[PDB]
Amino acid sequence: MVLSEGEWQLVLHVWAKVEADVAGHGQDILIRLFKSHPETLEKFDRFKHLKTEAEMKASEDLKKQGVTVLTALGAILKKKGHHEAELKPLAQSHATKHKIPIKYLEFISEAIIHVLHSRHPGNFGADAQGAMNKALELFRKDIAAKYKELGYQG
Ligand code: HEM
């Protein structure tokens, strides 16, 4: 697929708001993912023992992870579709070491769209959400195709 420049602008306009607070958004998104799909927490050995949302909000490790996830995702979105290089290493570790099914990437995409919608209503109307969804589907589709080349899942 191919987003138009206008769609990319809507995606990078709300992303610029997220970058004002990367660690806070990172927490909100991972906690939303873990509350919505608790099985995903099990993939994080460093903090899968966390039992509540308050323990999650106080975990430094979870917050660092969120910053790591959003910084790598922001670098991919800023490429506007030319992200082959950025995707390689990422697909190799998620397919061979961590073992993250495409279904989990769909879950966190959902969590991202939920948090932006809450925190950025004015910059996240229907057209901006449609563009963000399009950009995340593009990211999942290219990662799924790399997973297949690397020998993992479908
Ligand atoms: C927006 C999508 C995501 C991005 C951009 C992303 C990015 C990253 C990056 C940059 C790292 C560190 C470098 C590396 O290990 O590759 C990482 C590590 C990891 N990711 Fe992802 N990730 C995403 C989704 C997920 C999801 C949905 C899960 C699990 C349910 C996941 C599980 C992990 C785990 C287990 C690690 C290792 C953490 C540690 O060091 O113990 N990732 N991810």
Query: Per residue, what are the HEC states of 21-41?
Result: CHHHHHHHHHHHHHHHCHHHH
Closest CA to 75 of 19, 120, 141: 19
CB 113 within 8 A of CB 133: yes
Residue 140 to residue 99: CA distance in whole angstroms: 15
Task: Report DSSP state, residue 52.
Answer: S
CA distance linking residue 100 with residue 96, whole number of Å: 9
The CATH number for 1-154, chosen from 3.40.1030.10, 1.10.357.10, 1.10.490.10, 1.20.1250.20, is 1.10.490.10
Solving technique = X-ray
- Our answer on whether the CB atom of 10 is closer than 6 Å to any ligand 1 atom is no
Ligand 1, atom 28, lies closest to the CA of 100
Mutating to test ligand 1, I would choose from 90, 96, 137 the residue with most ligand atoms within 8 A of its C-beta, which is: 90
Identify the residue whose tokens are 């191919």.
2
End-to-end CA distance of the chain: 18
Q: What are the residue boundaries of the structural domains of the chain, listed by start? A: 1-154
DSSP state of 122: G
Atom of ligand 1 nearest to the CA of 46: 41
- What is the distance between the alpha carbons of residues 32 and 128, in angstroms, rounded to a whole number? 20
Phi, psi of 81 (to 5 degrees): 100, -20
Tokens of 57: 């909000």
Q: Which atom of ligand 1 is closest in space to residue 41's alpha carbon?
A: 30
- 8 Å CB contact between 81 and 138: yes
CB 46 within 8 A of CB 61: yes
Tokens of 81: 């579709």
Q: What burial class does residue 116 get, using C-beta atoms within 10 Å of its C-beta: 0-12 exposed, 13-18 middle, 19+ buried?
A: buried
Angle between helices 5-18 and 102-119 (to 10 degrees): 70
Q: Are the CB atoms for 16 and 139 separated by under 8 Å? A: no
| Of 65, 68, 69, 73, residue with least CA distance to 132 | 73
d(CA 100, ligand 1 centre) in Å: 8
Ligand 1 contact via 69 beta carbon (within 6 Å)? yes
Give the CB-side neighbour count of residue 34, counting CA atoms within 13 A: 23
Q: How far apart (Å, rounded) are the C-alpha atoms in residues 133 and 86?
A: 19
Cα R_g (the chain), whole angstroms = 15
Q: What residues contact 58, with CB distance under 8 A and at least 6 apart?
A: none
Q: In the structure, how many helices (H) and strands (E) does the chain have?
A: 7, 0
Which amino acid is it at 59?
Answer: S
Resolution in A, one decimal?
A: 1.8
- In angstroms, what CA-CA distances link 152 with 11, 23, 39, 78, 145? 29, 31, 20, 27, 10
With the most atoms of ligand 1 within 8 angstroms of its CB, the residue from 41, 77, 94 to mutate is: 94
State whether the beta carbon of 106 lies less than 6 angstroms from ligand 1.
Answer: no
Nearest C-alpha neighbor of 13 from the set 109, 84, 116: 116
